[PDB]
Write an enzyme that holds these catalytic residues in place. Structure first.
Site, PDB file in Angstrom:
ATOM      1  CG  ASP A  90     -13.993   7.939  -1.610  1.00  0.00           C
ATOM      2  OD1 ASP A  90     -14.057   7.383  -0.493  1.00  0.00           O
ATOM      3  OD2 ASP A  90     -12.947   8.440  -2.075  1.00  0.00           O
ATOM      4  NE  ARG A 138     -10.566  -4.595   0.199  1.00  0.00           N
ATOM      5  CZ  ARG A 138      -9.562  -3.879   0.707  1.00  0.00           C
ATOM      6  NH1 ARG A 138      -9.785  -2.665   1.209  1.00  0.00           N
ATOM      7  NH2 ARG A 138      -8.330  -4.387   0.722  1.00  0.00           N
ATOM      8  CB  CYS A 144     -14.052   2.507  -0.002  1.00  0.00           C
ATOM      9  SG  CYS A 144     -13.371   4.119   0.355  1.00  0.00           S
ATOM     10  CG  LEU A 145     -16.465   2.043   5.670  1.00  0.00           C
ATOM     11  CD1 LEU A 145     -16.051   0.702   6.244  1.00  0.00           C
ATOM     12  CD2 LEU A 145     -17.110   2.890   6.747  1.00  0.00           C
ATOM     13  CG  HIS A 174      -8.322   0.941  -3.341  1.00  0.00           C
ATOM     14  ND1 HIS A 174      -7.766  -0.268  -2.985  1.00  0.00           N
ATOM     15  CD2 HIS A 174      -8.816   1.481  -2.204  1.00  0.00           C
ATOM     16  CE1 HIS A 174      -7.915  -0.452  -1.686  1.00  0.00           C
ATOM     17  NE2 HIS A 174      -8.548   0.596  -1.188  1.00  0.00           N
ATOM     18  CB  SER A 193      -8.021  12.244   0.191  1.00  0.00           C
ATOM     19  OG  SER A 193      -7.105  11.184   0.420  1.00  0.00           O
ATOM     20  CG  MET A 194      -7.581  13.933   6.139  1.00  0.00           C
ATOM     21  SD  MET A 194      -8.932  12.788   5.734  1.00  0.00           S
ATOM     22  CE  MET A 194      -8.300  11.245   6.452  1.00  0.00           C
ATOM     23  NE  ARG A 242      -2.332   3.334   2.058  1.00  0.00           N
ATOM     24  CZ  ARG A 242      -2.436   4.651   1.873  1.00  0.00           C
ATOM     25  NH1 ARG A 242      -1.748   5.254   0.903  1.00  0.00           N
ATOM     26  NH2 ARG A 242      -3.229   5.373   2.664  1.00  0.00           N
ATOM     27  CD  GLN A 272     -13.199  -0.748  -1.135  1.00  0.00           C
ATOM     28  OE1 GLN A 272     -12.446  -0.566  -0.166  1.00  0.00           O
ATOM     29  NE2 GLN A 272     -14.432  -1.236  -1.000  1.00  0.00           N
TER      30      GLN A 272
END
Ligand SMILES: CCC[C@H](N)C(=O)O
Ligand SMILES: CCC[C@H](N)C(=O)O
Ligand SMILES: CCC[C@H](N)C(=O)O
Lengths: 320, 320, 320
Positions: free
Chosen positions: B229, B296, B269-270, B134, B233-234, B107, B137
Site C-alpha cells: 500500500d 468492499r 486497497c487502491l 480500516h 498518503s499525501m 470515516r 477493508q
C-alpha cells in the site's frame, strides 16, 4: 378529515382538528413503526423534492430518512434553482417539480416565494422553514408535548425570546389545540401585530388565554411548558454586537423554571446557544430538547403521508 | 454468534469466529444476491448515516449502493457536523444520529472521535476508515483471499509498505484466522509497538507465525499473498520530497513475486500509485486488486446486516 | 426486440424498431404507472451510476426520480472521477463502476470518453448528454410527439438553430421513424457533413425526405413540428458578442408558426432563452415544451428497464 393534496405553508389556514389529525398520524406512524417495528411502504412510488435555500442539514436528515422509511424517494436539490443563481422564473421551475417530485418540501428565505411556488404548482408544497413560520417544527413540539403530558388540553405554553417564525407558528396553532400562550419579547422585537392580532382572535374563538409582555419571568409564570429560542439567528453582527445586549435579561435558566408551574417542561428547536439558556435547564430531564428533535421525523412523515396518501391511522386517536 | 447492535470500530475486539461469520454472511449475500440473483430487503426500513470527514467516494459508492441493495436507505452527510465547522459537541450530534439513522458509518481522521462518537450513541458506529484502522477493508481483502484459495487456514500474508491503519487491521485480524503475518516497514515507520505487541500476542494464542523487518524481499519470502500500500498518503510534501526516498527500495514488483511462494497472489486497497508497484505485478492475473475492490460492498452489507438484523446465513459456512 | 445489456450512446446504432420499442415501453410505464397508478419495482435491487461532468440538475432530477420510482437506487457522482481532478485512468474507473452500479448514465463533454468508458465496462453506459448527441432527449421529444399526434408516421420535423448534439440525434433517428427532417442552420454552423451524410443515407433507405438550408422560414415551411434550441450554449463570449449576431435572423416566433403547417407544434429541450423564441410561441398551447420536459423521465426509465430487465410491455404497442 381530508388533507391529501393540501399543501402546508403554515398552520394558520388549518383547523385545529386538522393539525391534531397530523399529530395523530405522526403518533400512529411512530408507534406502528418505531414501537411495533413493522415496515410501512406508504410512500412507495413517490418522490419528494426538497429545496434548501440554505444548508439545513438536520431538517433534511430527518425528512430524507423519514420520507425514505415510508418507502418514498427523497430528492435533494440545493441551489440548482432560484435560490442562488437561477436563470428561469420559479413560476416555471414549479412546473418541472410538478412533473418530477409529487410533493415539495422547501426551506426558503421568504414566505413570498412559497405561496407563488405553491400557487404555480399542481403539487403540494411544504414549508420546510421560512422567515415567517416553521409549522413542521412546532408540529413536532406539540406532538412531543402531547406525548409527555398525554394531552395538550389546556396547558399554557411560555415564550421567552425574540419574535421569530417559530413563535409565530405556535401562535397560529397553540389556541387551535386549546393551549394558553404567554409570549415575552424585548420591547424591540414584538412580532408584527399583523399575526398577534390573529392569535388573539384564535384565542377568543377557542376560549384559550393569550397575553404578551417584555418581561420573561412574567410569561414563564404559570407556564407549563416554557419555550425559548436563540435571538442571535446570525442576521447581522452590528445587530447584536450591542443590539442584542438590549435583548439581555432573558437567558432562560432554572431561575425561570422556578417561577414556572410544577408540570413544567422545556422546549427548544436547537441548536445549543449558551446565550439563551444554561445547561442547567437545557439538560434538565424536564427538557424535551432531544425528543423534540426526534419527533421532527415522525411528524414530517405523517405530514407527507397526510398529503400524499389516503392512508388512515390505525390505532385510536390520542387524547389532545 | 450474535453481532446485532455491536458497533465495529476495529477487529481488535472481535473473536476470529466473529469476523469469520461476517465474511460468511458476506459470501452468503454475494452469492444469494449476485450469483442466484434474488432481491434481499434485509435492510428495508433502515437508514445509515454515513459521515465523511474527507471526500472518500469509492467507499461511499460501495456502501451507499450496498446498503441500498438490501433495501436500506443510505444517508450521505459531509461536514454538516464536527468535521469542518460544527458549532455543537459531537457528544450531542450522536444523539441526533441516534434518532435519525439506526447505524452510522463514519470515516474520520481520528479513532478518538470514533469511540466517543460510539460511546455517546445508542447506535452502532462503523469505522468507515480511521487513521489507525480500516477493518471493513481487510474484511473484504480476507473475503477475497478466502474466495481465491478457498481457505485462509494457514496462508502467510506479506506486508511491504509503511505502517498504516491497514497493516494494523491485518495484524489485529490475520492471526484470528490462523494466518501468518510477515510485515516489512522502513526503519522509520515500524507501527507503534503498542499494536504489534498485540499482534504477537494474538499469534501466540493461535499458533500463527509473526515477524517483521525493514527488508521487503524478506517479508515477501514464503509469502502466499503479499500485500502492499502506498507510503505517500499525501500527509505532507517535505515528508516525501526526500523523506520517502529513504523509504526507497520497496516498490513491490515481480522481482518480489519471484521470492514469493507459488500460490502467491497480490493485494492492494487502491488507488494505483506507480510508486509502490509496477503494472507488472498490479495487473498480473495473480493480483486480486479489483475483486478486492468489489468485495468492499458485499462485506459492508454483511457488516450492516450483521449489526442491524437477526438474519442468519442461508448456505453452508465457507471453509476458513 | 432484445435490448438488455445494450448500452446506449446514440440512436445511430439503433434500428428504428428498437427506438420505437423504447418509446413503447416508456408509454407503457407512463400509463401503467402515472395513469393506472400501480407501483413497478422493475428496478428493485439495481443501482445506477450517474456521472455528471457538469452540474446538470434537470436531467438528474428526472433520472434519479425515475430510476427510483421503478424501485432502483440512483447513485449520484460528480467529479470524484476523470471529470475534474482524477488520478486514475477511467479505463479502470469503469471497472469499479462495473462492480458497483450495474449501469451508468454519464453526462460528459466528449463522446470520446463515452465509447472508451463503455468499451472498458461490463456495464451498459448511457449517454446522459455528450457534445455530439443527446439521445434520451429526442427520445422523449419523439414520445411527446407520438402522444400528441398519435403517430410519427410521416410528419416533417423542422429544425431552426445551430447544429448541435440535439439536431444530430434527431438526424440519427427521425428517418428511422419515417419522419421528414428540415434542418436550417446559419452558413457558419452546418453540422459536420460526417453525420448529415449519414442522415441522408437513413432517409434514402426509409423513403423519408431530408434537406437543409440556412434560411429558417424555409425549413419551417411545411413543418409539422418545428424544433429549435438556443445557439448560445455559453461556449464563449467573443463567439457571440458579435459572432451570434451573424446568427441573427432566426428567433423562431409565430411569424414562423404561420408558415408552419396546420397540425403545427413546437419543441425545445429548455431552458427558456428569449434569444431564439418569444413567449408567443414558447407558451402557445401548440408548444409541448413542458410535456417534452416531463417525458424525459418516462423515457429514461424505459431506457433503463430496457437494458436492465427482461420486462416486456403490457399494453398494446402504440401506433408509430
Ligand atoms: C406517481 C407519481 C406521479 C408524478 N406526477 C410523477 O412525477 O411521476
Ligand atoms: C426502525 C428505525 C428506528 C430508528 N430509531 C429511527 O431513527 O427511526
Ligand atoms: C445485482 C447487481 C449486481 C452488480 N454486479 C453489483 O454491483 O451488485
Amino acid at each position: 378529515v381530508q388533507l391529501k393534496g393540501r399543501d402546508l405553508l403554515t398552520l394558520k389556514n388549518f383547523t385545529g382538528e386538522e393539525i391534531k389529525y397530523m399529530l395523530w398520524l405522526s403518533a400512529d406512524l411512530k408507534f406502528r413503526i418505531k414501537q411495533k417495528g413493522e415496515y410501512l411502504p406508504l410512500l412507495q412510488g413517490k418522490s419528494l423534492g426538497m429545496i434548501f435555500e440554505k444548508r439545513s442539514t438536520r431538517t433534511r436528515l430527518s425528512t430524507e430518512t423519514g420520507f425514505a422509511l415510508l418507502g418514498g424517494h427523497p430528492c435533494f436539490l440545493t441551489t440548482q434553482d432560484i435560490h442562488l443563481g437561477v436563470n428561469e422564473s420559479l413560476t416555471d421551475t414549479a412546473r418541472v417539480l410538478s412533473s418530477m417530485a409529487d410533493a415539495v418540501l422547501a426551506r426558503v428565505y421568504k414566505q413570498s416565494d412559497l405561496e407563488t411556488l405553491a400557487k404555480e404548482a399542481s403539487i403540494p408544497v411544504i414549508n420546510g422553514l421560512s422567515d415567517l413560520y416553521h409549522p413542521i417544527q412546532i408540529l413536532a413540539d406539540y406532538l412531543t408535548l402531547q406525548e409527555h403530558y398525554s394531552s395538550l388540553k389546556g396547558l399554557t405554553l411560555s415564550w421567552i425570546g425574540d419574535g421569530n417564525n417559530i413563535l409565530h407558528s405556535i401562535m397560529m396553532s397553540a389556541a387551535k389545540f386549546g393551549m394558553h400562550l404567554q409570549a415575552a419579547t424585548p420591547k424591540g422585537y414584538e412580532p408584527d401585530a399583523s399575526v398577534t392580532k390573529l392569535a388573539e382572535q384564535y384565542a377568543k374563538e377557542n376560549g384559550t388565554k393569550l397575553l404578551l409582555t417584555n418581561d420573561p419571568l412574567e410569561a414563564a409564570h404559570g407556564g407549563n411548558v416554557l419555550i425559548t429560542d436563540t435571538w442571535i439567528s446570525m442576521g447581522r453582527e452590528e445587530e447584536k454586537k450591542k443590539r442584542l445586549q438590549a435583548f439581555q435579561g432573558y437567558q432562560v435558566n432554572s431561575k425561570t423554571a422556578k417561577v414556572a408551574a410544577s408540570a413544567w417542561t422545556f422546549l427548544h428547536c436547537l441548536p445549543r446557544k449558551p446565550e439563551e439558556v444554561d445547561d442547567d435547564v437545557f439538560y434538565s430531564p424536564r427538557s424535551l430538547v432531544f425528543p423534540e428533535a426526534e419527533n421532527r421525523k415522525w411528524t414530517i412523515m405523517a405530514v407527507m403521508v397526510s398529503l400524499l396518501t389516503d392512508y388512515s391511522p390505525q390505532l385510536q386517536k390520542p387524547k389532545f
